[PDB]
Amino acid sequence: MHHHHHHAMDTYKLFIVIGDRVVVVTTEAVDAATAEKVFKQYANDNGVDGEWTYDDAAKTFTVTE
């Protein structure tokens, strides 16, 4: 027998206050650690530099500088 399991995911946000423009990127992930991996790759793939913070209740990551 076989069945597909569509796993549970929540949306996470990435606030990257870069220079003049503020960009908010949302994504979906099973948990915070998974979202962290996704946003880290996203940051690397799009040349985003800086230090980050995470607010769990808000499921929001913020990158500054």
Distance from C-alpha of 45 to C-alpha of 26, rounded to nearest angstrom: 16
Method for this entry: X-ray
SS3 51: strand
State this model's resolution in angstroms: 1.8
What are 34's two structure tokens? 């998974």
Domain ranges of the chain: 1-65
Instruction: Return the CATH number of 1-65, one of 3.30.1330.10, 3.10.20.10, 3.40.50.2020, 3.30.365.10.
Output: 3.10.20.10
